[PDB]
Structure formats: structure tokens, C-alpha cells
Subunit: 396 residues, 4 copies
């Protein structure tokens, strides 16, 4: 049977050290889950699983989907869990949700993700047996950018270093990177004033006490010449800056995964059905490229071609990387009309575990507005993976 995506929402996205700094990963996940339960008016004991992508877990919130479920209201009967496949976790959550619905096992579940990058722990592995060795304290954000490909493939400079390796290989200009970057920002400010972001966003309360419903990172005044001033993050004379990559961010996303039968039974409005998905492994040092083998596998299974897709959500982890995926797909200037229309990672940010759910929110809602048929969501994944899902619109 089919699996259908209803009421895909998300908090606004905050900067690392910005407006949501006082709020935990749970706090955000809780608001977003209450926001979904409110808009859909579902009976709480109807949710059979809360499955959340979450990339910097710790003992503050074990099996985070269960914690978010309890802390948000839901009864003691609702199970939950945590998934990590780095940048692709939000979509991993969704795919897992779809699988356990389509098998007949569950009729309705929550899929989403939660990231408080502002609040990721500092940790040590030296304090338990004592520090022969000294004691090191790792920053969970810094340290995660160097360990994702294991011992045999270290990458000291993180995903940032891997996005330099793609610029090198596919010969992509600084001008073009920033030119993509301006598009992202303009489409993000334009999507705000167009009012279309209000349906995606659950407003979040925070104390000084006020309510916030506008994303923090998108700037109207961003321009090409302004961007060209910025310093490329010494080791290489020849293009990635805080301006042409996505930053570190706070946010959560939720959506309901269900059958058309059950959706009709509870007054729900299906926006899309999962046609297919693909996963892939590429070189850690070339992680950016992940969407290519994965988009092939998902298109292959859907018996479809890249040109049948009316809308594409490709995460802009780094502009160089986005363009490199766009080289492989043989993308010309006309293709930007159908790619990240409400913006993406560079303007909005990349709150790792929640990104998946945000892209789904924008894919399934713009696809229902343009009355087009097919959508693709794909992203690279630190450590050298890529994940893609092909979605199709639902009619009445």
C-alpha cells in the first residue's frame, strides 16, 4: 500500500549562538511536535512511533523520539527512537517511517528531527580511568567534522575541506558559487514575504517572553560584490567562506507518515506519497557528491528520468558542492527554475538532524502549490554517503 506525508512542519531555523541558544534539542522537537498535533487535531494515542534524526545525541535525551513524545504531551503508550545518518537523518527518519507504514505494521507515525547545535556537548574519554595521558576535551561539533570517515580516511578540515576538493575537481569559479548563494538568499526572503513560509513554520516561544516565526539567517541585503569580500576559510591559494556555505544551526522538523485510508479517517490532507528512495556510499574526502549515485538509484527504482522531476530539493551544504552535483546532472541556467525554489542550506542553514524534514516540508508544499507531479529530495552526508527520495503529489 502507499505511504503518505501529512502536515510537514518545522520550527524556524536559528543561528548557532543565536535566537534559540536558550533552547535544548528537546525544547525544539517538543514545540514542533505540539505544533503538528495542534494543526492536524489528531488523537495523541494514534501516533505509533516517533522517529527522529538527531546527529549530536547525548545522555540529556536518550532515544530522543521517546523523550520528545513524552515532553510534548503524548501518552505513555507512544514509542520512539533516534536515528543518525548525518545530514541525511531527517530523510532516514522519513524513509524508516514509510517502510514501517507500507509493511502494514503501523497505520500512523511521526517522522522528524531535532538539532541544537548551540548546545552540543563538550566531552572527554579520559576522565573515567584518569589522565599517563593527560585529559582532552573535544567539541562535539569540531570533533565530528574529522572522524566521520574513520581511521583509513581522515579529513582534518571537515566537510569544508571536502567541498574544496569538489571545486578543484569540477573547476568551479568563486563567482558562480556566490552567484548561487545570492539566489538562495533572494528566494528565502522572497518566500518569506510571499507568506508561503507561514504554513511550514511552527512558531517558537522564548524568554527575555516573545514568539518567533521568522528564520534568522536569510538577509535581503546580500549582494554579489559584498560576498566577494569574504576570506576563504592559507593551505590553498585558490573558495569556500561563511558566505557561500551553510552554517551551524538550531531547529526541529515534524510530519505525519500514514496511509491514504487512515488519513481520510482522521480528516488529514496527504501532500505526497513516497515513490522510491536510494542510499549510496562515496569517498569520505568527496562526500559532497553523494546525491549522484543515490539519485540514480532512486530514479532507477521509480523507472524515471532526471527530466521527469518537476521539483528538486538538493541541500546546499556548500555552494561548490551543490554546483558539482549540478555539473553531473548536466544542469543549465534554466534548471535553477526548478531547484531549491524557497531557498536552501546556504540562506536557511543546516541544523543537521532537522534539514531532511525541512526539505520535505518545502518539497511537498511547493509541489502542491504548482500542481506539478514529481519531486526529488537528496543530500550529501558527512563521512561519504548520499540519500535520495522521489516523491509524487496526491490528488482528491
Amino acid at each position: 500500500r502507499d505511504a503518505v506525508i501529512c502536515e510537514p512542519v518545522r520550527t524556524p531555523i536559528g543561528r548557532y549562538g543565536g535566537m534559540f541558544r536558550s533552547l535544548t534539542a528537546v525544547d525544539l522537537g517538543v514545540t514542533a511536535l505540539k505544533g503538528l498535533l495542534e494543526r492536524t487535531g489528531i488523537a495523541a494515542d494514534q501516533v505509533e512511533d516517533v522517529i527522529l534524526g538527531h546527529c549530536y545525541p547525548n545522555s540529556e535525551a536518550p532515544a530522543i523520539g521517546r523523550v520528545v513524545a513524552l515532553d510534548a504531551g503524548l501518552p505513555i503508550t507512544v514509542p520512539g527512537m533516534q536515528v543518525d545518518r548525518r545530514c541525511g537523518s531527517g530523510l532516514q527518519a522519513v524513509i524508516q517511517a514509510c517502510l514501517q507504514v507500507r509493511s502494514g505494521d503501523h497505520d500512523l507515525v511521526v517522522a522528524g528531527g531535532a538539532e541544537s547545535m548551540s548546545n552540543v556537548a563538550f566531552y572527554s574519554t579520559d576522565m573515567r580511568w584518569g589522565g599517563r595521558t593527560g585529559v582532552q576535551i573535544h567539541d562535539g561539533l569540531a570533533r565530528g567534522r574529522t572522524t566521520a570517515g574513520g581511521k583509513f580516511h581522515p579529513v582534518p578540515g571537515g566537510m569544508l575541506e571536502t567541498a574544496e576538493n569538489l571545486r578543484r575537481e569540477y573547476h568551479i569559479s568563486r563567482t558562480e558559487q556566490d552567484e548561487l548563494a545570492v539566489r538562495s538568499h533572494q528566494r528565502a526572503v522572497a518566500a518569506q514575504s510571499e507568506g508561503v513560509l507561514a504554513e511550514e513554520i511552527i512558531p517558537v516561544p522564548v524568554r527575555t517572553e516573545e514568539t518567533i516565526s521568522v528564520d534568522e539567517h536569510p538577509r535581503a541585503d546580500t549582494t554579489v560584490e559584498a560576498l566577494a569580500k569574504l576570506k576563504p576559510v592559507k593551505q590553498d591559494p585558490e573558495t569556500v567562506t561563511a558566505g557561500n556555505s551553510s552554517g551551524q544551526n538550531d531547529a526541529a522538523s515534524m510530519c505525519i507518515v500514514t496511509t491514504p485510508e487512515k488519513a481520510a479517517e482522521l480528516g488529514l490532507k496527504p501532500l505526497v506519497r513516497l515513490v522510491s528512495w536510494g542510499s549510496a556510499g562515496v569517498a569520505p574526502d568527496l562526500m559532497g557528491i553523494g546525491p549522484v549515485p543515490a539519485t540514480e538509484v532512486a530514479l532507477a527504482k521509480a523507472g524515471l528520468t532526471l527530466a521527469d522531476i518537476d521539483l528538486i530539493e538538493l541541500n546546499e551544504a556548500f555552494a561548490a558542492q551543490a554546483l558539482a552535483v549540478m555539473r553531473e546532472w548536466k544542469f543549465g541556467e534554466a534548471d535553477h527554475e526548478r531547484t531549491n525554489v524557497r531557498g536552501s542550506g546556504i540562506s536557511l542553514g543546516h541544523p543537521v538532524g532537522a534539514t531532511g524534514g525541512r526539505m520535505l516540508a518545502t518539497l511537498a508544499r511547493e509541489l502542491h502549490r504548482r500542481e506539478a507531479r514529481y519531486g526529488l529530495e537528496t543530500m550529501c552526508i558527512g563521512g561519504g554517503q548520499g540519500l535520495a527520495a522521489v516523491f509524487e503529489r496526491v490528488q482528491e
Copy 2:
């Protein structure tokens, strides 16, 4: 189509601060995955996913299944990931594996789990913006996790240990019975060792010599010499001790999840097929009871009754808890003949993320030995969850 479990293996299980202390969660997961790829002789680019349950993750090893995969040999094309549904994570890994095989999406994946409890981080959420106002706290990931799993609305200061005190209270279970169940666990563990049957489950681990024997099982384990101080002063009638509960442990487990078609194509030997599974949520303060609503849901879907099950793997997180699940199932002394035959959590230990895969190893292999038909794997899950899977033997 069917999903089938092949060559379910696991490292030996070490004590917290015991023989495996020098080795990381990755180290264990790597040995075990190499051990699986060596016994089955599969071509590495055949594995389409490494899915690992892993309960105390950190930035040493993000999306741990991918990490374990590269660090063990496999090519850059094998995807991987990490799951957490606490004690049920190993089985969560297996169920996800089965789902994405049965859907036609993948033909072959690795399911498993890795836990280094010896090497769980200390951490702080105060060091980033600074501790002027607030001071700086450092949490022990093991201690701190036993108090946060039910959230703000359901705190449990004393951990899963305190919830296992709540079950003894409700279901009026004696200390004698607890420790008597504990002796059976140990005897079945030492007996399963000398019977040589554990050698097929265990991948030997090298450590800066080679080890292939579990560290926690003691032959000299006795009813009297146990009848030890009950951990939790707050309660006069308190009964749970380091002796009648499962400790903290190091280990990893792997197994192949595939179709009978593909298993035949690579010379593999399917031990079981996943018939059904169920998940449930219970009270966090009553987590130990999780197997009950979960076992109903899994039996219900299989159209089966608790009595059609020839073998049961119920995790002995705490003896009180295991007996409480056994009250509900209306278990008499004859039922212990079909329950945790090669031992369980109290004698072997509970290396959280790996437990699922261990039980599956002992379920699938003893079910093939006794030539019986149906198996059940179920466990309670910190924070008030239960998970169950019903497995059937293959011909």
C-alpha cells in the same frame, strides 16, 4: 518476500572495566563485522547497509555503521548508520534491516550493534557559553542516561534499577526467587560454554593475546553465597543487587539480513525468517514490563499464541523484571525449560546496543539445533518501551 537471518555472531561480552577496556565501540564492531565477512566469505560490495544499534554515541564515531564498515575493510560504496531505541536497539537494527530487505529495496544488509560502556564519554553542556553564572557540570554518560530516559514529566532518580524495585513491589516477588533465577542463568551460561555451542556465536577478539570466552559467567555461582547488599537504604524490602541484575558491559554483534534467493546465490545458510514484530510504550517508572504489550502485538500479528513458541529469549535486565514478565505470561516451573536456555543478561551482561544481536544469535542457533519451529525475542527498554520479534526456523 521473506527476510532471513544468516550467520548471527557477536564478540565475547566483557565487564565494564574488564578485558575489553582498552578497546573502543568501533574496535568491537570492527572485529565482529570482519568475523562475519570471514565466516560467510561474502564479497564486501554486496553489503548494501550497515545498520547498528548504539546507545551512547558521540563524535568519536558519527553514524557508527558507516564508520564500522570502513574501519573493517569494506569499500567506500557501502552505506551505514546508527540507531537508538535503548535496550531494544539491536533488535531495532534487525527489524529495520528486515523492512528494507522485504520491500525489495535491498537484497543484502548487515544488522548489528556495538557498545563500549567502558569508554562512554563524560560530557558537559556548560563549557560552550561558559560557566560564570551557572558553574560547570560534568555528567557521566552512563549515570546521567539512567535518569533522563523518561523526560521531565517522568523522572526516575534511581535508574532502571529503581524501576526494577517497582516491579518486585507490584508483583510481590521474593528475593529467593530472584537469586534462584540468577543461578539458572549462570549455570546455563557455564554449561553452554563447556558444551562448545558458544564457539559458533563468538568471534574471537585480539587485545594488546586472543579472547573467546565471556568474562561475567561464574561456575561457582551459589544461592547462599549470593543471599549481597541491595543497592537501593531508601527501601527496607529492597532486593535488587549487582548479583541479580545484569551489569554494564562491552561487546558488539553482527548478522546478515537477506532473501532466500540471494542467500542461495552466495552459499549462505538462513537460520530464521522474521515472521512479525511489535513495539510498545509503557510507564517509564514500570519499563521492565515492556515485553508484555509488545509480545501481544507480535503474537497477534503472527496469528499465534504464547504456547506455540518453542523458544523464548527474554532479556534479564533485572531478575525481578524478568519474573514480572513471567507472571503476566502465566509461567510455571516447566516454562524455564524453553526460556534463555544458553543464559541471558544476568550471567552474560547487558552491553546495551549489542544485546539485541546476541539474543538473536542464541535464538536462531538453538532453534536450528532443537529442530523446533518458533522463537520469540523480547526486551524491556529504558524510558518505558518494549520490543518483540517472532522468528521462524528455515528448512
Copy 3:
């Protein structure tokens, strides 16, 4: 046993905890101030025979801090140095030790001072070396934790020196009405320009600062503020106590012979000094037994003293010492004339040097004869020195 004389007593400006000097270490401040002293006196560096610094929150960033400050500030590898801790009295402790080793004939010239970065005091643990498997891991704030351990196991004081400054209000029945004088004397001493001779300007990256951060020109009504009470219905606030602060002080300690030889200008000579122990829970009172011992040795009476520097750790405490000395409103004409701890702050290890700066320089301006410097000390101690003007 010849005379010991105090030359060119200088100090940095005093910054708030988390204020202007936050970017700068204990060493940084010490260094500036020692450079500022060696610049105004024009001494040959190899002339300093010891750098002796009071310093109350030391750590392995800067072991034997006086040595470190000496090297980091220019002085040659032949200049020795060290660190002293007698809490609030360390600055004066450093001076007294400097005077003792000069008067014995052992050294002809030494530097005495102190250095405190309260903004940069370490967080530390005693659980991370053998492991926190049994015990958990605690991390103390070196400021918070120091305010509870100074009296040892047999005399704990949970609320710190703050709690002891309540115990004095309770005992000597001193009213909340009875801090503004401190502030007015501090702002007035600034505009009078007299502070410019005390202060070595500090560069912070890159502007230069030479004005103390804490003194405000703008009142009694203030009476608004919340007493730090929940435990006690009846009066100490962040407004009527001295805060936590950054600063350093330096001065030269030498003989009149050697001072004349290098063109130096002796401001005072150390007549006498006294130390005392009182109850930890009543630490504020320390100046009393100590001021007796120092007056007794100088064969002098409290009324022969033309100028008094009593550290205003907490206003309650300062008045309690003033009750004991039988002080009437006319006595405030001769006490903390350029201000004190409440308006200026209490950068622990540097306070001693600051008071000496203001004591020796105001005494030379007024052309009066005798000075007293005295302060309470966390853990229950009191130190006093009696100083006499020169030429």
C-alpha cells in the same frame, strides 16, 4: 637594621570582573605595571634583587608568579622572584617581606607587589586524575570555592566573606542607612588628577585605559538594592560591598642610601607591622588586634595617625572596625580619602599595593607624618603596617 623605604608605588587601573581587563591575564597586568615602574624610576633592571608578589588564585599558568612577571616584563635572567598568599593581605605581606629582607642588609633593592586576574581564575577538578567512576566529577569555580574553604574543616562558612560581613552587622548593630563617601572620594580624586600619579596606563587590543572602571559619579536613595536576604530577614549588597576585580600593583623597596644613589624619591619608611588571627566567621574584625600590635610596636596611639587606609571589603565590616576604634564623624576626614574597596574594587592580591600607593602619596601631599594600612583577610586574619613620611 637600617631603614626600608617605599619608592614610586604604582598600580594598574582597577577593572571589574568580566570588564575592561577580561582579555588580559594575571601576568599581563603584573607585566604592564612592572614596566610602568621601571620606566618612571629609570632603574637599571639588574638592580632589582627580588620580585615578590601577593597573588591569591595562582595556577600552573604562572608558577612563582614574581619570577614570571619579571622575565615577561624585560628584566634579566639574574632577577629572582616568587609568590605569596595571605589572602586579602598578600599585597601588604609582599611589602613586609620586602622590607624585612632589605632591613636585614640582605638586599639593597627589591620589587614588592601583587597581581590578580579574577576574570581568568581557573575552573579546576580533583576527580579527573584517578577517575570519577566511583565518585562522579566535580568542577569548582576557583572564586566560589575559595570563599568556603579559607577557615578549613572546623570553621566552615557557606556564604563566604559575605556571610561574615553579616555576622558583624548583627554583632555591632550597624544600620543599612549607615558607600557614597567612597564613590564621591573616588570620582573626586579622579578629576583632581591625583590618580594619574598612582596609575600605569594599560594597553588593551588597541586603545589605552587609565581610568578605574567601578567608580560612578551618579546616590543614597541604592537603598533599592536586594540584600544578597532569603536566609536572614534583616544588609549587604553588590552596592555596599567591594566586588571582584582585575589589577596589579608594584613598588620599589630599598634603603635611603641606595635610593639617593639611583635618584629615587622615598615617600615613606616602614615603622612597624602586625599580624593577627581572629575567628573565620568574624574575619572582618582582623584589623583590630593587628592595629594594636603595630601601634604597640611603634609606641604610638591610634590618634597620632594622620591617615588611615582601611580596606572596605564590606561596608558593615569597615564600620565595625570603626566602632572598635571609637570613631566619630570627624574621623572620616582622615580615612580612605581617595576612596577604597567599595568604589574601587578588591582585586585580591593587588589591594595591598593599591592602599600603599594612596597612603604614601596622600601623606606626602598633606605633609603629615604617620600612616596606617590595615585589612581583614579571608579565613580570619588581619594585617597592619604603620608608615612614616620621609624628608
Copy 4:
């Protein structure tokens, strides 16, 4: 002035880093030793006018440690106290400061000593207060970190005092054989001094059992046994000092009374020595081990004495290479080892930084009273490039 005299100079036994005294704090040790002094001398507590302690790894556990030790050991709320740090020379710094404030007429009786728990030295950070957002967070080991900062920015020494003790072997061409020969002597004199029973008068026993024997001295220490050890920095230097020919890291405390012969007579005390003179000096940080040289000159010069008038010498054996280098400068022949570190030293006993000074004083003053000789020298190198020396003279009764 008048004289300053040293009475009943005592110390705890010296423990290894991570050894028998691991459960005990710097305070704990300082407290036992102070109680042991107050018990053997039977002094009225309110007679102590200052507790002055050398202490090299202080922290907020015990501020102005001398005051803390005083309260924690019994003495009344009227006894003042404090902490000094001049690294290895702090125990002697404490004594010199004691003597100065006694000789000036200021105090009649004070306690001088030192306390070090190297086993319990804090791990610390300067990044946790305003946050490690920009910078990350570092945690320094107070022992490791102190061996690299003592000479400041303009003179860093990555390998610590260990690296400086090699610079001396290099300069003064001192052989490995010789280093380890000194090292056997130290051990033999330390085990011999134990069985001779002479260490029992120096040592306050520490408490559940009681312990009164030093942990580090081994009777079985051999020349061949030691030659089989790996030079700690052999990797950076082919010709490179070992855990066997240098002093380790250690736990201990020392106390002693500083007073006048008048007051000593008034309380039934037995003055062992009087402080004749002292000197301090600064040398190169990278050459710290040499500090005793310019310091010993200054102290001898002030006493108007010559190095040959000294009947007994306590030179701290921080590192055997360093001890010998000071011995080269003093023109020492094999006969001089008869009057140097007779009850042992740093290599056999250990170097509990802040307590070393008091220990050497204990051995100097007591052996000088036993041999009925006249003059003594106590000198040691100091991390960061300093040296301190005191000349002591026996008192005759």
C-alpha cells in the same frame, strides 16, 4: 638583631605519586606533621605566631594553606598563616621568611614548613568561564603544565626540568655511569639511614594502618640494574636521564619551629641550629639545575666563609646530572661525597616539591648535631631558573 634557631625539624614519610599517600590531601599531610610537632615539643598552641608554608600547586581547596593547616590541626583562631611559592626552594623560603620575622624582633615563635600532594594536583582550564565557542576547551595537568611555563614566554622549555638536566650533562660532559653511581649512593645511604634508626627522629608517622617508612628507597638498587633503563628523552637526543637517576614526583609535608634561644629556653626547646646566612639567585631557565652555584657563593660570602669550612652539605638531587654539575663547579673529588647528602637525597627519597626544603633542614640540623660538627649548607635548584642557599650553624647548649 638576635639569633633565629631551628627546633624539632620534622616531616611525614615521603610517598610516591600514586602511592601510599594517594588518599590524603596536601592539607591532610600538613596537618599530621603539624600535630606531630606540637606533640613532641609540647608547646602551648597560642604560642605559634605564624604558620608559613611552601606549597607549589595550590588551589581553592586550601587558600593561604598555612592558616588552613593551622586550624585543621587544632591551633586556636588567633594563629595567622600563609602560603609561599618559590618552586623547589619554597620549603627553605618558608624558613628564611620565618627567620627574618623572628630576628627583627617581630615574632618570638613561628612554624615554617611545606606541604605537597602531587597525587592530588588539580586538572584545570582557563576556557570554561567565558566559553570554548571560538577556541575549544583545554584541560591542563597541573604537574605537566607547570614544567613548561616556569620560565615565561621568552624562555620556554618543552621537556621541563628534565630537559634542563640534560643541558647540564651536555655542557659539563657527565657520564651515564657516574649519574647512576651517585644514584646507588643515594639509595644505599637512604636504606642505611633507615635501619640505623636515625630517620625515626625526623619522621612523624601518618595514619586503617600507620606508616613511618619512606616509600621510594630500595635496598636492591644496582648499578647494572639501573643501566638497563630507557632515557626519557632518548628519542630527541641520542646521547640523553631516567626515572632511576632523577627524583620522582611525591607526597609529603615538613614542619619546624623557628624561635629565639631565649624563648626556646623558656619552653624547654632544644635548638639544633642557627641561621647564619642565606642567598638567592637567578640563572637561565634552560640551565636551572645550576642555581645552587651563584646562591652558594652569596651565602658563603655573607657568612665570610669558604666552601671547605662547611662540615655538611644538603644539595637536592633533583636530577643526578644536575647534582654532579653543581659538584663540578665546587671542584668536588671522591672524598667530598663523605660530607654530602649523608642520609640520602632527592633521587632515593623523592622531591615532594613544597616539602623538600623542610626535609633537607631536618636531615641537615640533626646529622650536624650527631657528628658534633659546626657548619651546614642547604641549597637547591628551582624550576624557572633560581637557586637558594642557607648556611646553618650548630648550637651548643
